[PDB]
RNA sequence: CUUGAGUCUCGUAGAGGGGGGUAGAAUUCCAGGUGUAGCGGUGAAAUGCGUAGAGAUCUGGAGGAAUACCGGUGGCGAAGGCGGCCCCCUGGACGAAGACUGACGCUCAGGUGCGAAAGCGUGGGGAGCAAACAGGAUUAGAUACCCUGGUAGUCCACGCCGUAAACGAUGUCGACUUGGAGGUUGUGCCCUUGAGGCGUGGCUUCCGGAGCUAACGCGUUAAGUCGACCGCCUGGGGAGUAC
């Protein structure tokens, strides 16, 4: 039926979480390792406009202390 | 007006500053104008590496819109505040002002994980719970 | 890129009486808005490069409708650059 | 460096616990215990393991400058032992796995190995 | 260098296979070398030419059945 | 006239420019504490630094360049050019409706304006690395090769001729030429079922058909089909200097 505009599974094969929101850690954690950074997003299968806008969200979300900044935080 | 989305967080012990300094800071942004399209407090935090030192601080996401000229003069006056320790305020480009990325995770806080003790009194004093001074 | 209240007064002043901002006339007028701000920015930033590109495309058109302003009607231009108050 | 040595009954302070730093370099590994509050309770290294020259800097000199560090400290009376590691340089797990013979639980093996936000311009190097 | 992704059970040694995944890229890969500031767009950014040889490498299996090699 | 171009209000995407603000981390450095013998360099090594107590570590502070992985064949500028994150000032581009003027066009001798990098005058700033300079190491001998010490330099502001590898290994812009798909973006619609599809625009790019090339290569953004105008070449060396 019409309409329906994202169910599930449906845009994208990797759905995209956030664009440019970061006031949620756990959106910004949907692509952060243990180690505490970002994996690359040929890996992810991630959608280009919300990483691009995201190389911005998380500098921000790390200068805001929602995530660690660096190895040493451990 | 372009619209520029503020978080930023207190320092614990300093937070009792906050409260007479909000009410001059939104009758800067209604006297022109702007508006305050939300005002959600978070309560404490655990900060995951200290700002300015100690490990916690106090979460107020305020979410203006203002007229770009008023917004300069406000900004490098809550950077150089000694009871905020840091903020960050986003792009005007596509940018939100409902519908709350971290909506549930706001009222979970209020409800059930917040410190229930005074210098989170005080936040909630800056936060929505706002209680000011007369002008 | 124009206050929305300056567009307005442009718009009641010069062009025609229908009102528009595609005429020779409100475009100089539009233009010189542009510069005026521009050359008060100019003042100082004299390394601001990539900005004075549009500089120059506003002062390179402003000449040039100008120009087809006297290459037509001579009441128009003589009109147009005493309402408009342009160059010293 | 490191001595044949009877066996050992020696007293000191009987701290039965410390932090451990492991300083991973290019050419070396250095090794040193801390007090947890943070003070120097001893240290060895793999150029004293007399390796010397690059054969100091491989796994097992690694490894034998830990169970150095780990021997003498027993007289400092330690039970157990934890860790963090910073540097890129050999002894990755024989390090560890050394400081874990020397009969000590290892139960957080830290990371630390420092990333700067783009620190300081090394030196060039080879030509590629 | 343990590398920081922590491992299923703690243990003396290790498993840094497991943990890697986008670790000392750029940052403290290029270790002693002379450092530029946008240089990296042109010396790293290796991704295109690195999905082609993804794509070959799938593509062939299949192809070399067809040509009857196999 | 619109078929060229131009322009108003709305939306959108990006490291464009110029000025402000801001956090944490290794080297490094200062102060105090703890503590013993090498530390450092490489192919291996010596110079270098240390027992006059080095190296390393804890707590606090100092200081400056810088800020990734995200960052992509992406995107922005005029060729070169642009990368932490945020605000002020401001350019240029992409979409869409209502609507407007109506060749106002192309190219450009002269021209004014403007830098990747270092060079460069003074102020501010110096953490690290380094031409030079010392010394080691190398060896047909070693200024090259290779290492250690180490200054001006690199960093900011204005200012001076804008230098080169100023590019799709296309002068400019413009008109026309089977397309498909990627990278990635306005926006109508989808089970909103691959960074996906279709509808209708977008740059940007791979692939290959016509044509073109000596060959690579280009291919609808041409290096095709041509169009106008400017810059500029006429064998090498000596000379991109001389004048």
Same mark, same amino acid.
């Given at each position: 039926a019409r309409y329906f505009r994202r169910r599930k599974f449906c845009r994208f094969t990797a759905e995209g979480v956030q664009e440019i929101d970061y006031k949620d850690i756990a959106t910004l954690k949907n692509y952060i390792t243990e180690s505490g950074k970002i994996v690359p997003s040929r890996?992810?299968?991630?959608?280009?406009?919300?990483?691009?806008?995201?190389?911005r969200a998380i500098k921000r979300a790390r200068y805001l202390s929602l995530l660690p900044y660096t190895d040493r935080h451990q | 007006m372009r619209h520029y989305e503020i978080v930023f967080m207190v320092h614990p012990d300093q937070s009792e500053q906050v409260?007479?300094?909000?009410?001059?800071?939104?009758?800067?942004?209604?006297?022109?104008?702007?508006?305050?399209?939300?005002?959600?407090?978070?309560?404490?935090?655990?900060?995951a590496y200290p700002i300015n030192k100690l490990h916690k601080a106090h979460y107020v996401l305020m979410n203006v819109e203002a007229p770009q000229e008023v917004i300069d003069e406000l900004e490098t006056t809550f950077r150089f505040n000694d009871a905020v320790i840091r903020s960050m305020v986003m792009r005007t480009k596509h940018?939100?002002?409902?519908?709350?990325?971290?909506?549930?995770?706001?009222?979970?806080?209020?409800?059930?994980?917040?410190?229930?003790?005074?210098?989170?009194?005080?936040?909630?004093?800056?936060?929505?719970?706002?209680?000011?001074?007369?002008? | 890129s124009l206050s929305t209240e300056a567009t307005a007064k442009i718009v009641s002043e010069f $062009?025609?009486? %229908?009102?528009?901002t595609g005429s020779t006339e409100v475009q100089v007028?539009?233009?010189?808005?542009?510069?005026?701000?521009?050359? $008060?920015?100019? %003042?100082?930033?004299?390394?601001?490069h990539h900005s004075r590109r549009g500089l120059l495309r506003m002062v390179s058109q402003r000449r040039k409708l100008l120009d087809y302003l006297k290459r037509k009607d001579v009441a128009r231009y003589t009109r147009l650059i005493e309402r408009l108050g342009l160059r010293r | 460096a490191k001595?044949?040595?009877?066996?050992?009954?020696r007293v000191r302070k009987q701290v039965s616990d410390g932090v451990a730093h492991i300083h991973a370099s290019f050419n070396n590994t250095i090794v040193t215990i801390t007090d947890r509050q943070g003070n120097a309770l001893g240290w060895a290294t793999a150029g004293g393991s007399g390796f010397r020259g690059?054969?100091?800097?491989?796994?097992?000199?690694?490894?034998?400058?830990?169970?150095?560090?780990?021997?003498?400290?027993?007289?400092?009376?330690?039970?157990?032992?934890?860790?963090?590691?910073?540097?890129?340089?050999?002894?990755?797990?024989?390090?560890?796995?050394?400081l874990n013979a020397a009969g000590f639980r290892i139960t957080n093996i830290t990371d630390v190995t420092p990333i700067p936000h783009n620190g300081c311009r090394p030196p060039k190097k080879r030509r590629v | 260098p343990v590398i920081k992704v922590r491992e299923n059970e703690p243990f003396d040694v290790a498993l840094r296979r497991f943990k890697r995944s986008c670790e000392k890229a750029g940052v403290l890969a290029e270790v002693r070398r002379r450092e530029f500031y946008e240089?990296?767009?042109?010396?790293?950014?290796?991704?295109?030419?690195?999905?082609?040889?993804?794509?070959?490498?799938?593509?062939?299996r299949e192809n070399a059945r067809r040509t009857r090699l196999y």
């Open positions: 890996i992810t299968g991630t959608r280009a406009k919300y990483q691009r806008q995201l190389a | 409260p007479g300094m909000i009410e001059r800071y939104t009758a800067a942004i209604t006297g022109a104008e702007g508006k305050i399209h939300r005002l959600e407090d978070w309560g404490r935090r655990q900060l940018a939100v002002t409902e519908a709350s990325p971290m909506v549930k995770a706001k009222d979970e806080r209020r409800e059930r994980r917040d410190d229930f003790a005074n210098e989170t009194a005080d936040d909630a004093e800056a936060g929505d719970s706002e209680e000011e001074e007369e002008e | $062009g025609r009486d %229908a009102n528009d007028a539009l233009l010189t808005a542009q510069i005026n701000h521009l050359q $008060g920015h100019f %003042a100082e930033h004299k390394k601001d | 001595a044949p040595i009877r066996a050992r009954k690059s054969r100091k800097s491989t796994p097992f000199a690694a490894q034998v400058a830990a169970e150095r560090c780990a021997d003498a400290v027993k007289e400092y009376g330690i039970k157990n032992l934890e860790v963090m590691v910073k540097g890129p340089g050999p002894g990755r797990e024989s390090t560890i796995r050394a | 240089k990296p767009t042109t010396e790293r950014k290796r991704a295109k030419a690195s999905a082609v040889k993804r794509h070959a490498k799938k593509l062939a």
